Amino acid sequence: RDCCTPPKKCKDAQCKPQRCCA
């Protein structure tokens, strides 16, 4: 799983600093 791959993830911390979240 990833922060931008389906299911994307932008709620955690290590995933916030990601162009696919901020």
PDB file of all heavy atoms in Angstrom:
ATOM      1  N   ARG A   1       0.853  -1.217   0.000  1.00  0.00           N
ATOM      2  CA  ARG A   1       0.000   0.000   0.000  1.00  0.00           C
ATOM      3  C   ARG A   1       0.876   1.251   0.000  1.00  0.00           C
ATOM      4  O   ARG A   1       2.003   1.219   0.454  1.00  0.00           O
ATOM      5  CB  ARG A   1      -0.884   0.016   1.253  1.00  0.00           C
ATOM      6  CG  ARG A   1      -1.755  -1.243   1.268  1.00  0.00           C
ATOM      7  CD  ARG A   1      -1.190  -2.236   2.288  1.00  0.00           C
ATOM      8  NE  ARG A   1      -1.968  -3.503   2.211  1.00  0.00           N
ATOM      9  CZ  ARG A   1      -2.535  -3.973   3.288  1.00  0.00           C
ATOM     10  NH1 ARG A   1      -3.371  -3.213   3.943  1.00  0.00           N
ATOM     11  NH2 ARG A   1      -2.251  -5.188   3.674  1.00  0.00           N
ATOM     12  N   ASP A   2       0.339   2.330  -0.512  1.00  0.00           N
ATOM     13  CA  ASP A   2       1.125   3.597  -0.553  1.00  0.00           C
ATOM     14  C   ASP A   2       0.262   4.794  -0.162  1.00  0.00           C
ATOM     15  O   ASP A   2      -0.903   4.654   0.150  1.00  0.00           O
ATOM     16  CB  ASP A   2       1.627   3.803  -1.986  1.00  0.00           C
ATOM     17  CG  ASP A   2       3.134   4.071  -1.964  1.00  0.00           C
ATOM     18  OD1 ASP A   2       3.476   5.237  -1.841  1.00  0.00           O
ATOM     19  OD2 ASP A   2       3.858   3.095  -2.073  1.00  0.00           O
ATOM     20  N   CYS A   3       0.863   5.953  -0.192  1.00  0.00           N
ATOM     21  CA  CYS A   3       0.113   7.185   0.172  1.00  0.00           C
ATOM     22  C   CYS A   3      -0.632   7.763  -1.032  1.00  0.00           C
ATOM     23  O   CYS A   3      -1.534   8.562  -0.873  1.00  0.00           O
ATOM     24  CB  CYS A   3       1.124   8.235   0.654  1.00  0.00           C
ATOM     25  SG  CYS A   3       2.262   7.767   1.986  1.00  0.00           S
ATOM     26  N   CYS A   4      -0.238   7.347  -2.210  1.00  0.00           N
ATOM     27  CA  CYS A   4      -0.909   7.862  -3.442  1.00  0.00           C
ATOM     28  C   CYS A   4      -1.411   6.734  -4.331  1.00  0.00           C
ATOM     29  O   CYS A   4      -2.060   6.990  -5.325  1.00  0.00           O
ATOM     30  CB  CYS A   4       0.113   8.681  -4.235  1.00  0.00           C
ATOM     31  SG  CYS A   4       1.401   9.525  -3.292  1.00  0.00           S
ATOM     32  N   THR A   5      -1.101   5.513  -3.984  1.00  0.00           N
ATOM     33  CA  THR A   5      -1.583   4.396  -4.834  1.00  0.00           C
ATOM     34  C   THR A   5      -2.926   3.897  -4.270  1.00  0.00           C
ATOM     35  O   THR A   5      -3.083   3.815  -3.070  1.00  0.00           O
ATOM     36  CB  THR A   5      -0.572   3.242  -4.775  1.00  0.00           C
ATOM     37  OG1 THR A   5       0.691   3.855  -4.598  1.00  0.00           O
ATOM     38  CG2 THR A   5      -0.448   2.495  -6.119  1.00  0.00           C
ATOM     39  N   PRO A   6      -3.872   3.567  -5.126  1.00  0.00           N
ATOM     40  CA  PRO A   6      -5.189   3.079  -4.661  1.00  0.00           C
ATOM     41  C   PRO A   6      -5.064   1.759  -3.865  1.00  0.00           C
ATOM     42  O   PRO A   6      -4.531   0.800  -4.384  1.00  0.00           O
ATOM     43  CB  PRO A   6      -5.961   2.782  -5.962  1.00  0.00           C
ATOM     44  CG  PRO A   6      -4.961   2.943  -7.125  1.00  0.00           C
ATOM     45  CD  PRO A   6      -3.725   3.642  -6.592  1.00  0.00           C
ATOM     46  N   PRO A   7      -5.544   1.700  -2.622  1.00  0.00           N
ATOM     47  CA  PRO A   7      -6.182   2.824  -1.882  1.00  0.00           C
ATOM     48  C   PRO A   7      -5.141   3.865  -1.468  1.00  0.00           C
ATOM     49  O   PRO A   7      -4.184   3.542  -0.793  1.00  0.00           O
ATOM     50  CB  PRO A   7      -6.751   2.177  -0.605  1.00  0.00           C
ATOM     51  CG  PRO A   7      -6.278   0.710  -0.584  1.00  0.00           C
ATOM     52  CD  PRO A   7      -5.498   0.429  -1.871  1.00  0.00           C
ATOM     53  N   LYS A   8      -5.332   5.090  -1.870  1.00  0.00           N
ATOM     54  CA  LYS A   8      -4.338   6.127  -1.485  1.00  0.00           C
ATOM     55  C   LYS A   8      -4.379   6.373   0.023  1.00  0.00           C
ATOM     56  O   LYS A   8      -5.298   5.956   0.697  1.00  0.00           O
ATOM     57  CB  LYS A   8      -4.676   7.431  -2.220  1.00  0.00           C
ATOM     58  CG  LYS A   8      -4.823   7.130  -3.712  1.00  0.00           C
ATOM     59  CD  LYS A   8      -4.905   8.452  -4.492  1.00  0.00           C
ATOM     60  CE  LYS A   8      -4.767   8.190  -5.998  1.00  0.00           C
ATOM     61  NZ  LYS A   8      -6.111   8.083  -6.636  1.00  0.00           N
ATOM     62  N   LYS A   9      -3.376   7.044   0.525  1.00  0.00           N
ATOM     63  CA  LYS A   9      -3.340   7.324   1.985  1.00  0.00           C
ATOM     64  C   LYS A   9      -2.723   8.692   2.254  1.00  0.00           C
ATOM     65  O   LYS A   9      -1.558   8.910   1.987  1.00  0.00           O
ATOM     66  CB  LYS A   9      -2.469   6.256   2.660  1.00  0.00           C
ATOM     67  CG  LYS A   9      -3.253   5.601   3.798  1.00  0.00           C
ATOM     68  CD  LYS A   9      -2.872   4.401   4.670  1.00  0.00           C
ATOM     69  CE  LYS A   9      -4.140   3.783   5.263  1.00  0.00           C
ATOM     70  NZ  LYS A   9      -3.966   2.313   5.440  1.00  0.00           N
ATOM     71  N   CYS A  10      -3.520   9.584   2.776  1.00  0.00           N
ATOM     72  CA  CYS A  10      -3.005  10.949   3.075  1.00  0.00           C
ATOM     73  C   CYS A  10      -3.487  11.427   4.439  1.00  0.00           C
ATOM     74  O   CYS A  10      -3.634  12.612   4.671  1.00  0.00           O
ATOM     75  CB  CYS A  10      -3.519  11.901   1.991  1.00  0.00           C
ATOM     76  SG  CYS A  10      -2.769  11.749   0.354  1.00  0.00           S
ATOM     77  N   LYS A  11      -3.722  10.488   5.318  1.00  0.00           N
ATOM     78  CA  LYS A  11      -4.195  10.849   6.682  1.00  0.00           C
ATOM     79  C   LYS A  11      -3.049  10.743   7.687  1.00  0.00           C
ATOM     80  O   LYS A  11      -2.945  11.536   8.601  1.00  0.00           O
ATOM     81  CB  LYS A  11      -5.299   9.865   7.084  1.00  0.00           C
ATOM     82  CG  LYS A  11      -6.614  10.289   6.427  1.00  0.00           C
ATOM     83  CD  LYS A  11      -7.427   9.038   6.080  1.00  0.00           C
ATOM     84  CE  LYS A  11      -8.882   9.440   5.831  1.00  0.00           C
ATOM     85  NZ  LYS A  11      -9.638   9.494   7.113  1.00  0.00           N
ATOM     86  N   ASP A  12      -2.211   9.760   7.491  1.00  0.00           N
ATOM     87  CA  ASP A  12      -1.064   9.578   8.420  1.00  0.00           C
ATOM     88  C   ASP A  12      -0.063  10.721   8.281  1.00  0.00           C
ATOM     89  O   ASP A  12      -0.263  11.639   7.510  1.00  0.00           O
ATOM     90  CB  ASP A  12      -0.361   8.262   8.067  1.00  0.00           C
ATOM     91  CG  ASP A  12      -1.076   7.105   8.767  1.00  0.00           C
ATOM     92  OD1 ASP A  12      -0.863   6.981   9.962  1.00  0.00           O
ATOM     93  OD2 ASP A  12      -1.795   6.410   8.069  1.00  0.00           O
ATOM     94  N   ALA A  13       0.994  10.638   9.037  1.00  0.00           N
ATOM     95  CA  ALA A  13       2.027  11.707   8.972  1.00  0.00           C
ATOM     96  C   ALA A  13       2.998  11.485   7.823  1.00  0.00           C
ATOM     97  O   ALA A  13       3.108  12.297   6.931  1.00  0.00           O
ATOM     98  CB  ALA A  13       2.845  11.670  10.263  1.00  0.00           C
ATOM     99  N   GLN A  14       3.683  10.381   7.871  1.00  0.00           N
ATOM    100  CA  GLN A  14       4.658  10.080   6.797  1.00  0.00           C
ATOM    101  C   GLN A  14       4.027  10.129   5.402  1.00  0.00           C
ATOM    102  O   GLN A  14       4.710   9.928   4.417  1.00  0.00           O
ATOM    103  CB  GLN A  14       5.219   8.674   7.039  1.00  0.00           C
ATOM    104  CG  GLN A  14       5.646   8.552   8.505  1.00  0.00           C
ATOM    105  CD  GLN A  14       6.791   7.543   8.620  1.00  0.00           C
ATOM    106  OE1 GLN A  14       7.669   7.484   7.783  1.00  0.00           O
ATOM    107  NE2 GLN A  14       6.819   6.734   9.643  1.00  0.00           N
ATOM    108  N   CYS A  15       2.743  10.393   5.340  1.00  0.00           N
ATOM    109  CA  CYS A  15       2.062  10.455   4.011  1.00  0.00           C
ATOM    110  C   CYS A  15       1.562  11.870   3.704  1.00  0.00           C
ATOM    111  O   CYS A  15       1.145  12.149   2.599  1.00  0.00           O
ATOM    112  CB  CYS A  15       0.852   9.513   4.039  1.00  0.00           C
ATOM    113  SG  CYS A  15       1.128   7.762   3.659  1.00  0.00           S
ATOM    114  N   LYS A  16       1.607  12.736   4.681  1.00  0.00           N
ATOM    115  CA  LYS A  16       1.134  14.125   4.438  1.00  0.00           C
ATOM    116  C   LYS A  16       2.090  14.916   3.531  1.00  0.00           C
ATOM    117  O   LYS A  16       1.648  15.601   2.632  1.00  0.00           O
ATOM    118  CB  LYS A  16       0.974  14.850   5.783  1.00  0.00           C
ATOM    119  CG  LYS A  16      -0.491  15.263   5.960  1.00  0.00           C
ATOM    120  CD  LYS A  16      -0.673  15.897   7.341  1.00  0.00           C
ATOM    121  CE  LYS A  16      -1.723  15.106   8.126  1.00  0.00           C
ATOM    122  NZ  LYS A  16      -2.004  15.767   9.432  1.00  0.00           N
ATOM    123  N   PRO A  17       3.384  14.830   3.785  1.00  0.00           N
ATOM    124  CA  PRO A  17       4.377  15.552   2.966  1.00  0.00           C
ATOM    125  C   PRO A  17       4.536  14.864   1.604  1.00  0.00           C
ATOM    126  O   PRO A  17       5.611  14.451   1.218  1.00  0.00           O
ATOM    127  CB  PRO A  17       5.688  15.465   3.785  1.00  0.00           C
ATOM    128  CG  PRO A  17       5.425  14.486   4.950  1.00  0.00           C
ATOM    129  CD  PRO A  17       3.956  14.058   4.908  1.00  0.00           C
ATOM    130  N   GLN A  18       3.444  14.768   0.899  1.00  0.00           N
ATOM    131  CA  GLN A  18       3.470  14.120  -0.432  1.00  0.00           C
ATOM    132  C   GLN A  18       2.585  14.888  -1.406  1.00  0.00           C
ATOM    133  O   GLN A  18       1.406  15.059  -1.170  1.00  0.00           O
ATOM    134  CB  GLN A  18       2.908  12.703  -0.274  1.00  0.00           C
ATOM    135  CG  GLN A  18       4.028  11.677  -0.452  1.00  0.00           C
ATOM    136  CD  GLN A  18       5.150  11.968   0.548  1.00  0.00           C
ATOM    137  OE1 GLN A  18       4.926  12.071   1.737  1.00  0.00           O
ATOM    138  NE2 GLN A  18       6.370  12.110   0.105  1.00  0.00           N
ATOM    139  N   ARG A  19       3.179  15.342  -2.471  1.00  0.00           N
ATOM    140  CA  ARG A  19       2.398  16.106  -3.486  1.00  0.00           C
ATOM    141  C   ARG A  19       1.018  15.485  -3.697  1.00  0.00           C
ATOM    142  O   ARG A  19       0.098  16.145  -4.134  1.00  0.00           O
ATOM    143  CB  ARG A  19       3.156  16.082  -4.822  1.00  0.00           C
ATOM    144  CG  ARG A  19       4.330  15.102  -4.736  1.00  0.00           C
ATOM    145  CD  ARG A  19       4.943  14.937  -6.127  1.00  0.00           C
ATOM    146  NE  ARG A  19       5.513  16.243  -6.562  1.00  0.00           N
ATOM    147  CZ  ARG A  19       5.763  16.443  -7.827  1.00  0.00           C
ATOM    148  NH1 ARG A  19       6.605  15.654  -8.436  1.00  0.00           N
ATOM    149  NH2 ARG A  19       5.164  17.427  -8.440  1.00  0.00           N
ATOM    150  N   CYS A  20       0.904  14.224  -3.384  1.00  0.00           N
ATOM    151  CA  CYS A  20      -0.407  13.546  -3.560  1.00  0.00           C
ATOM    152  C   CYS A  20      -1.251  13.679  -2.296  1.00  0.00           C
ATOM    153  O   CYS A  20      -2.109  12.862  -2.029  1.00  0.00           O
ATOM    154  CB  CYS A  20      -0.150  12.059  -3.821  1.00  0.00           C
ATOM    155  SG  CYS A  20       0.423  11.062  -2.426  1.00  0.00           S
ATOM    156  N   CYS A  21      -0.987  14.710  -1.541  1.00  0.00           N
ATOM    157  CA  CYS A  21      -1.761  14.916  -0.289  1.00  0.00           C
ATOM    158  C   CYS A  21      -1.832  16.399   0.070  1.00  0.00           C
ATOM    159  O   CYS A  21      -2.903  16.956   0.210  1.00  0.00           O
ATOM    160  CB  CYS A  21      -1.049  14.164   0.839  1.00  0.00           C
ATOM    161  SG  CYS A  21      -0.873  12.377   0.641  1.00  0.00           S
ATOM    162  N   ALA A  22      -0.687  17.008   0.211  1.00  0.00           N
ATOM    163  CA  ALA A  22      -0.670  18.453   0.561  1.00  0.00           C
ATOM    164  C   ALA A  22      -1.143  19.301  -0.616  1.00  0.00           C
ATOM    165  O   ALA A  22      -0.924  18.978  -1.767  1.00  0.00           O
ATOM    166  CB  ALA A  22       0.771  18.848   0.906  1.00  0.00           C
TER     167      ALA A  22
END
